[PDB]
Amino acid sequence: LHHAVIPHGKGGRSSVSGIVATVFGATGFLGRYVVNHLGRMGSQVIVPHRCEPYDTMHLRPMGDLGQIIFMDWNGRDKDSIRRAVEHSSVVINLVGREWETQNFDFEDVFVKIPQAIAQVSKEAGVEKFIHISHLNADIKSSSKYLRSKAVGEKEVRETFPEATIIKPAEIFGREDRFLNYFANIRWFGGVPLISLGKKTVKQPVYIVDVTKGIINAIKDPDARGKTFAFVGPSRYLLFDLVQYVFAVAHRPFLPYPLPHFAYRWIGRLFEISPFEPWTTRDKVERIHTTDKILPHLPGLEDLGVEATPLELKAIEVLRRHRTYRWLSSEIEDVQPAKTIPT
Partner 1 sequence: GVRTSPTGEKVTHTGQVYDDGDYRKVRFVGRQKEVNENFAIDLIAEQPVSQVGSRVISCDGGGGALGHPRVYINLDKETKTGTCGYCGLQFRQQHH
Partner 2 sequence: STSVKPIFSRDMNEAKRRVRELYRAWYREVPNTVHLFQLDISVKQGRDKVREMFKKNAHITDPRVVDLLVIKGKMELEETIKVWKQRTHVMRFFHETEAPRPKDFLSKFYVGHDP
Partner 3 sequence: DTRPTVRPRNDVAHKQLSAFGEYVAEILPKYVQQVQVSCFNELEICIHPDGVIPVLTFLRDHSNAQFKSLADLTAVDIPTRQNRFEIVYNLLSLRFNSRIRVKTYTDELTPIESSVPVYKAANWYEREIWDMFGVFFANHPDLRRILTDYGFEGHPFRKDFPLSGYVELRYDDEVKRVVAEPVELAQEFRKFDLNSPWEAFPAYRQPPE
Ligand X SMILES: NC(=O)C1=CN([C@@H]2O[C@H](COP(=O)(O)OP(=O)(O)OC[C@H]3O[C@@H](n4cnc5c(N)ncnc54)[C@H](OP(=O)(O)O)[C@@H]3O)[C@@H](O)[C@H]2O)C=CC1
Residues that bind partner 2 (CB under 8 A): 7-11, 40-41, 313, 315-316, 319, 327-328, 330-332
Stretch that binds ligand 3PE, among 29-37, 111-119, 185-193, 216-224 (CB under 6 A): 185-193
User: Of residues 17, 27, 89, 148, which one binds partner 1 by CB under 8 A?
Assistant: 89
Stretch that binds partner 3, among 12-20, 135-143, 189-197, 218-226 (CB under 8 A): 12-20
Question: What track of x and - describes contact with ligand X for positions 87 through 126 (by CB under 6 A)?
Answer: -------xxxx------x----x-----------------
Query: In the complex, what is the shortest distance from the CB of residue 103 to ligand PLC, in angstroms, rounded to a whole number?
Result: 9
DSSP string, 13-34: TTSB-S-EEEEETTTSHHHHHH
How many residues in the shown chain lie near partner 1 by CB under 8 A?
15
Nearer to partner 2 (CB atom), residue 40 or residue 122: 40
With a CB cutoff of 8 Å and minimum separation 6, the contacts of 29 are: 171, 173, 175, 176, 177, 207
CA–CA distances in Å: residue 132 to residues 149, 152, 271:
9, 10, 25
Q: Euclidean distance between the first and final Cα of the chain, in Å?
A: 45
Q: Does the footprint of ligand 3PE cover residue 190 (CB under 6 A)?
A: yes
Question: What track of x and - describes contact with ligand CDL for positions 297 through 326 (by CB under 6 A)?
Answer: --------------------------x-x-
Stretch that binds ligand CDL, among 45-53, 160-168, 250-258, 265-273 (CB under 6 A): 250-258
Q: Does the footprint of partner 1 cover residue 72 (CB under 8 A)?
A: yes
Query: In the complex, what is the shortest distance from the CB of residue 109 to partner 1, in angstroms, rounded to a whole number?
Result: 24
Work out the burial of residue 43: count CB atoms within 10 Å of its CB; fewer than 13 is exposed, 13-18 middle, 19 or more buried: buried
DSSP, res 310: T
Partner interacting with residue 327 (select from ligand PLC, partner 2, partner 1, none; CB below 5-8 Å by kind): partner 2
Provide the 10 A C-beta neighbour count for residue 287.
Answer: 23
**Amino acid occupying residue 137:** A
Question: What track of x and - describes contact with partner 1 for positions 34 through 53 (by CB under 8 A)?
Answer: ----------x-x-------
Q: Does the footprint of partner 1 cover residue 65 (CB under 8 A)?
A: no
Stretch that binds ligand CDL, among 159-167, 184-192, 216-224, 266-274 (CB under 6 A): 184-192
Residue among 151, 155, 153 nearest 116 (CA): 155
CA–CA distances in Å: residue 312 to residues 122, 301, 315, 335:
41, 18, 7, 12
**Amino acid occupying residue 2:** H
Nearer to partner 2 (CB atom), residue 2 or residue 10: 10
Nearer to partner 2 (CB atom), residue 36 or residue 184: 36
User: In 3-state terms, what secondary structure has residue 192?
Assistant: strand
User: In 3-state terms, what secondary structure has residue 243?
Assistant: helix
User: Of residues 29, 70, 104, 181, which one binds ligand 3PE by CB under 6 A?
Assistant: 181
Interacting residues with ligand X between 120 and 179 (CB under 6 A):
132, 134, 168, 170-171, 177-178
Q: Does the footprint of partner 3 cover residue 13 (CB under 8 A)?
A: yes
State how far Cα 342 lies from the chain centre. 26
Q: Is 224 left (phi over 0), alpha (psi -120 to 50) or beta?
A: beta
Q: Does the footprint of ligand CDL cover residue 11 (CB under 6 A)?
A: no
Report strand pairing: 201-202 vs 236-237. antiparallel
For residues 310 and 315, give the distance between their C-alpha atoms in angstroms, rounded to a whole number: 9
Which phi and psi angles does 49 have, rounded to 5°? -120, 150
DSSP, res 110: I
Binding site residues, ligand CDL, CB under 6 A = 188-190, 251-252, 254, 323, 325
Could you list the residues that contact ligand X (CB under 6 A)? 25, 27-31, 49-51, 75, 94-97, 104, 109, 132, 134, 168, 170-171, 177-178
